């Protein structure tokens, strides 16, 4: 289940996109779960996202009453009340608009230049998968000891035809010992038994 989360932040905050971080980004804008499986990719985009006179399209939340939950997005824009005095929708003393704009200028220091971040989230080896790496497939060899790779699940064993019937949302089957003992062939949807 490949998902691509994308955004632009300051360069000094790229460290904050990681499991278990704290800071203005990890607290108020974008939080990753602790048991995160996936990849984080970032790169400086100063020549794209910064223009002379500042680029003020990119915003971030500065104030929030509580920390975000993992993968939660908050786009509310209601006045943050920083004191006991109430804010009735008007910015004032102890009343702040919660979003502030990055000031991205081409001559900002490397810590203040825009960085484009992409977080890829996915799960591995538990369900049918439709995105795969560039590896060529071979013909199926049965009744012989082979090293196999079925949809990313590598191993060693003898392949034999199977009587099991998987529901359409299932791809692997496991034992009491939790080892994979049945698989569905990706090219031909036929169940095969894996025997040591």
């Amino acid at each position: 289940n490949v998902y691509a989360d994308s955004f632009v932040i300051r360069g000094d905050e790229v460290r904050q996109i990681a499991p278990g971080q704290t800071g203005k980004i990890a607290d108020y804008n974008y939080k990753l779960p602790d048991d995160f499986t996936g990849c984080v990719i970032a790169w400086n985009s100063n020549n794209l996202d910064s223009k002379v006179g500042g680029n003020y399209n990119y915003l971030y939340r500065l104030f929030r009453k509580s920390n975000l939950k993992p993968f939660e997005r908050d786009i509310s824009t209601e006045i943050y009340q920083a004191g006991s005095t109430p804010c009735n929708g008007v910015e004032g003393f102890n009343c702040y608009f919660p979003l502030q704009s990055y000031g991205f200028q081409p001559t900002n220091g490397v810590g203040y230049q825009p960085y484009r971040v992409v977080v890829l989230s996915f799960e591995l080896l538990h369900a049918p998968a439709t995105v795969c790496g560039p590896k060529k497939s071979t013909n199926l060899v049965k009744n012989k000891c082979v090293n196999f790779n079925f949809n990313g699940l590598t191993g060693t064993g003898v392949l034999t035809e199977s009587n099991k019937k998987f529901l359409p949302f299932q791809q692997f089957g496991r034992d009491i010992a939790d080892t994979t003992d049945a698989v569905r062939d990706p090219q031909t949807l036929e169940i095969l038994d894996i025997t040591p």
Partner: protein
């Protein structure tokens, strides 16, 4: 156009669902998760008698909701999920307007009494306005029935499990055992604390009833068949 207009029952071992998508046979698997406590008190609401009763209050959504509905004429049409249910924050709309299944995560200005209308479908009085919409997910166009759903909101995913079962019954929740199957995981990424059911009125309520129970962190012992199906479970905190 936004026009204007408690009972309790037992949960006889209901609301169990498949925790993963791995095929298993002939095994007893113990699991710790959010489940409906066996033999707990659900709340009962109905809509009946041309109008006498039309129950669609705003209920809390604590950690997850078990929702069951015994109906014969498709009165329950979907739900609204949110935290403030107004246009200040984002909300989730799941609705079946007799032709499509619409799943929207927008900024809705909901009506105080949202419903749909049948005269043929005639009205969609749910929300005054939709803005800043982030997610959409539709389908192809288009008491006798018990329809059970489990809604969970974990790690930015809205998980829905469902099971439709033919019944033949007069009053209450059928005492039985049925395992709910995974329906969909939506990457909506919003904060959900309250929810409200969407009913369709006739222009009169009709006749339908639904029950709402709340999940809690429980330990269950699930029994897997020689096929993949779940056939029984144990609630370790029910009794000694």
């Amino acid at each position: 156009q936004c026009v204007n207009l408690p009972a309790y029952t037992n949960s006889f071992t209901r609301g169990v669902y498949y925790p993963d998508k791995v095929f298993r046979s002939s095994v007893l698997h113990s699991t710790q998760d959010l489940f409906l406590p066996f033999f707990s008190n659900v709340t009962w609401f109905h809509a009946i008698h041309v109008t006498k009763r039309f129950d669609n209050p705003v209920l809390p959504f604590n950690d997850g909701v078990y929702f069951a509905s015994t109906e014969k004429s498709n009165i329950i049409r979907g739900w609204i999920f949110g935290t403030t249910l107004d246009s200040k924050t984002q909300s989730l709309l799941i609705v079946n307007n007799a032709t499509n299944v619409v799943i929207k995560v927008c900024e809705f200005q909901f009506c105080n009494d949202p419903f749909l209308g049948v005269y043929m479908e005639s009205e969609f009085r749910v929300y005054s306005s939709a803005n800043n919409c982030t997610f959409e997910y539709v389908s192809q166009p288009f008491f006798k029935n018990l329809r059970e759903f489990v809604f969970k909101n974990i790690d930015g995913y809205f998980k829905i499990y469902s099971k439709h079962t033919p019944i033949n019954l007069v009053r209450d929740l059928p005492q039985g055992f049925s395992a709910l199957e995974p329906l969909v995981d939506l990457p909506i990424g919003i904060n959900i604390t309250r929810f409200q059911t969407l009913l369709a009125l006739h222009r009169t309520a009709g006749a339908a009833a639904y029950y709402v129970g709340y999940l809690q962190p429980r330990t269950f012992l699930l029994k897997y068949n020689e096929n993949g199906t779940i056939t029984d479970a144990v609630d370790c905190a029910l009794d000694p």
